[PDB]
């Protein structure tokens, strides 16, 4: 069958926090894109420069699947040309992105009464990420003129914030699982093909 | 430091019944009470938290109630797979404490044991000891008397028994009994019998073999 | 999948010391609170302690009865958490679990557990088992059904695992709880029931592993003509 392992990305038991977003490299396989675009589960499925149907007749050097959790009102930030805490400080797509962004509501799994504080995002950073950059550092953010010597305190912020997802949140504040598929064509044989 | 108690110690019920188990905290914990289910050989599985909220994927036949010090877990439509020990846990503060558990057993119709006997292997006999094994397979209820007879002498002090937990699908048990004697003593006698008494058997069943035939 | 893989079970000496390790995969390990929970034979779970996530880096809390003797730590770069046990009384014998906090708070319950490892605290030496066949014969008449198994005898400490045909055979298996013999060594049997007509053409092998002594035995159980 040589079937590309999209099942292990999309049906993974848990997804990463967005500041520590996961990347899976997909290679040397036949990619059944029909199970994706025919899925009735996704609330977001937006492609840039390809179409899921006319991926079944294309080959790429590699395919990257990046996955993470954010809240619903941030899903729009997973798009080229966006601003916001997620696009600026957590996960950044390039202006000329080729790929697909897929997302679905995971309130049933990832929220808890009283709050699930296990999902985090970077709220403070000195500059914006470059496209496809990952920052997992936890240095104290100096927000004022007094230096902080890395402690946490007034004007000296821990850079990551918990989402605290609750199932009664409005949908804008419920958790969404996101997968981003990037399609890489290099001067190298192309090993990921549709059927 | 908060002490948790549970009641009853154990209970038996039939498939389809509703079962109720209780938990009490030694001080007010508001509604910070979780319930776990623990099946044989397995880690506890979280069923309910903040006293009445289901964990993902947990069937709605599980429900919890209560606030303050007294809490109640209700299982409606009891299934064979629900055989387990149930524990409560306060989760209001740091030394997280657990109750002593309630065992839930499944009542079902009588099923008589299949009875099998195994003489010692020649490989074991080479080593100076003989183990004779009697197996009672897939029966209900768990109480069965197992006697060892060697040339019709009732054996005493030289056998040990073990029983499985209730089967998660058919709610039966199995039982093994092992008679251990020296090779010298084994070779002195001829008839080895395992006799089984059980509610499913109209009269006791003896399975036997003659050493060397 | 979310996996918590535990290490460190087996025999440890009172007045020795022992580290249990919990290796995580499938989620952002550093964002979770890690608890250690233990369960002595026949009793309910007892929380041992935990270590909080990156928002309170490295901070810990303990049950009063282990404070000072046990130390919880974590290495987020390796995705491991540990329990360093330096006291070790015989009372510490128990199955130990690592587990994730469901909410990531100090008001927490545990929705993801490792499989548990048995720690046996005893002044004693390990002993691997002998494995003997329980061969099927006419004295396993039932119907067109035969019983056969293996006797796993004279080992210490618990536990032993048994599989059949390398895990391919699972239906009809019963592995019994071990019994402690008067010698102070354990013994266990594992049986399986199969169709009679399979005994001539299907080989049955019990795969026994006693990790505390690194004893691995594969025993063919052949039919007797009795
Ligand atoms: C993610 O899983 C869903 C769930 O379907 C089941 O679970 C899977 C782990 C696998 O064992 C499937 O065969 C199961 O059906 C998948 O959705 C199903 O996809 C199949 C196509 O193989 C389709 O016939 C079913 O109608 C789908 N069922 C539902 C409820 O949507 C899904 O395709 C998996 N995702 C990927 C990317 O593989």
- State the DSSP string of A142-159: E-SSS--TT--BTTEE-S
The residue among C2, C4, C44 with the most chain B CBs within 10 A of its CB, best to mutate, is C44
Query: Is A82 found in the same domain as A13?
Result: yes
Residues A96 and A177 in one domain: yes
Shortest CA gap C76–chain B (Å): 22
Fold of B114-210: Immunoglobulin-like (2.60.40)
Say if residue C20 is exposed, middle or buried (CB neighbours under 10 Å; 0-12, 13-18, 19+). Answer: buried
Say if residues C149 and C38 touch (Cβ distance below 8 Å). Answer: no
CA atoms in the 13 A half-sphere facing the CB of C27: 23
Give the start-to-end residue ranges of the domains of chain B: 4-107, 114-210
Cis before B8 (ω within 30): yes
Residues A69 and A143 grouped into a single domain: no
Gap from B53 CA to chain C (nearest CA, Å): 12
> Using an 8 Å Cβ cutoff, are B85 and B105 in contact?
no
Which one of A11, A14, A113 would you mutate to disrupt binding with B, by most B Cβ within 10 Å of its Cβ? A113
* Full domain range(s) for residue A96: 2-114+167-195
Q: Which residues contact A29 (CB under 8 A, 6 or more apart)?
A: A2, A3, A4, A5, A191, A192
Judge if A85 and A20 occupy the same domain: yes
Contacting residues of B for A175, CB less than 8 Å apart: none
Are A92 and A119 members of one domain?
Answer: no
- A143 and A192 inside one domain: no
Q: Provide the token pair at B104.
A: 């839930």
Q: In CATH terms, are B4-107 and B114-210 the same topology?
A: yes
User: What Å resolution does this PDB entry report?
Assistant: 1.8
8 Å CB contact of A120 and C103: no
Strand duo C94-101 + B53-54: pairing? unpaired
Which of these, A89, A111, A91, A93, lies nearest to A160 by C-alpha position? A89
Does A75 lie in the same domain as A10?
Answer: yes
Together in a domain, A153 and A66: no
A137 shares its domain with A51: no
Interface residue A108 vs chain B (CB under 8 A): yes
Token digits of residue B205: 């069943």
In order of A62, A114, A164, C66, the CA distances from C50 in angstroms are 41, 20, 20, 12
What φ, ψ does residue C23 adopt, rounded to 5°?
Answer: -110, 120
Map out the domains of chain C with their CATH numbers.
3-121 (2.60.40.10), 130-221 (2.60.40.10)
| Number of domains observed in the structure of chain A | 2
Query: Strand C186-195 to strand C179-180: parallel, antiparallel, or no bridges (unpaired)?
Result: antiparallel
Mark whether A110 and A147 lie in a shared domain.
no
Mention the CATH class of domain B4-107: mainly beta
Q: What share of chain C is helix, strand, coil (3-state, %, to 5)?
A: 10, 50, 40
Q: Are A27 and A77 found together in one domain?
A: yes
| Domain shared by A30 and A92, yes or no | yes
What atom in ligand 1 is closest to the CA of residue A41? 31
Please answer whether residues A90 and A122 qualify as being in contact, where contact means their C-beta atoms are separated by less than 8 angstroms.
Answer: yes
């Amino acid at each position: 069958t040589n079937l590309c392992p999209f099942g292990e990305v999309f049906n993974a038991t848990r997804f990463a926090s967005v500041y520590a977003w996961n990347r899976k490299r997909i290679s040397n396989c036949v990619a059944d894109y029909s199970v994706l675009y025919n899925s009735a589960s996704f609330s977001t499925f937006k492609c840039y420069g390809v179409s899921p149907t006319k991926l079944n007749d294309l080959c790429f050097t590699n395919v990257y699947a990046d996955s993470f959790v954010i809240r619903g009102d941030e899903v729009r930030q997973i798009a080229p040309g966006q601003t916001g805490k997620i696009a600026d400080y957590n996960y950044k797509l390039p202006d000329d992105f080729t790929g697909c962004v897929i997302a679905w509501n995971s309130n049933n799994l990832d929220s808890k009464v009283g709050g699930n504080y296990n999902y985090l995002y970077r709220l403070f950073r000195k500059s914006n990420l470059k496209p496809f950059e990952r920052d997992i550092s936890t240095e104290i953010y100096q927000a004022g003129s007094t230096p902080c010597n890395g402690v946490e305190g007034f004007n000296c912020y821990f850079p990551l914030q918990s989402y605290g997802f609750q199932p009664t949140n409005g949908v804008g504040y419920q958790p969404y699982r996101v997968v981003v598929l990037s399609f890489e064509l290099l001067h190298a044989p192309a090993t990921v093909c549709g059927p | 430091d908060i002490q948790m108690t549970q009641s009853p110690s154990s209970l038996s019920a039939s498939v389809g019944d509703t079962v109720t188990i209780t938990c009490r905290a030694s001080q007010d914990i508001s509604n910070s009470l979780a319930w776990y289910q623990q099946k044989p050989g397995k880690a506890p599985k979280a069923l309910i938290y903040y006293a009445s909220n289901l964990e993902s994927g947990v069937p709605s036949r599980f429900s919890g109630s209560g606030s303050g010090t007294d809490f109640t877990l209700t299982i409606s439509s009891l299934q064979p797979e629900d055989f387990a020990t149930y524990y409560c846990q306060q989760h209001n503060n740091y030394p997280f404490t657990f109750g002593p558990g309630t065992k839930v057993d499944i009542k079902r119709t009588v099923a008589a044991p299949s009875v099998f006997i195994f003489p010692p292997s020649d490989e074991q006999l080479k080593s100076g000891t003989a183990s004779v094994v009697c197996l009672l397979n897939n029966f209900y209820p768990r109480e069965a008397k197992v006697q060892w007879k060697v040339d019709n002498a009732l054996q005493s002090g030289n056998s040990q028994e073990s029983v499985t937990e209730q089967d998660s699908k058919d709610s039966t048990y199995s039982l093994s009994s092992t008679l251990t004697l020296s090779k010298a003593d084994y070779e002195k006698h001829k008839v080895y019998a395992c006799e089984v008494t059980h509610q499913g058997l109209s009269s006791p069943v003896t399975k036997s073999f003659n050493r060397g035939e | 999948e979310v996996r918590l893989v535990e290490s460190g079970g087996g025999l440890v000496q009172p007045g020795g010391s022992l580290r249990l390790s919990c290796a995580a995969s499938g989620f952002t390990f550093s964002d979770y609170y890690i608890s250690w929970v233990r369960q002595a034979p026949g009793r309910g779970p007892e929380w041992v302690g935990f270590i909080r996530n990156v928002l309170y880096r490295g901070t810990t809390e303990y049950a009063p009865s282990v404070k000072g003797r046990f130390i919880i730590s974590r290495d987020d770069s390796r995705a491991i958490a540990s329990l360093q046990m330096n006291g070790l009384k015989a009372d510490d014998t128990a199955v130990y679990y690592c587990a994730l906090g469901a909410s990531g708070t100090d008001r927490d319950w545990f929705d993801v557990w490792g499989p548990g490892v048995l720690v046996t605290v005893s002044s004693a030496s390990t002993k691997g088992p002998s494995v003997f066949p329980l061969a099927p014969s006419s004295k396993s008449t039932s119907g067109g059904t035969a019983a056969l198994g293996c006797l796993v005898k004279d080992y210490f400490p618990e536990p032993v695992t048994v599989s059949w045909n390398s895990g391919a055979l699972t239906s009809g298996v019963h592995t019994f709880p071990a019994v402690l013999q008067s010698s102070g060594l354990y013994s266990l049997s594992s049986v399986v029931t199969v169709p009679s007509s399979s005994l001539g053409t299907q080989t049955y092998i019990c795969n026994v592993n006693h990790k505390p002594s690194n004893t691995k035995v594969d025993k063919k159980v052949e039919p007797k003509s009795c």
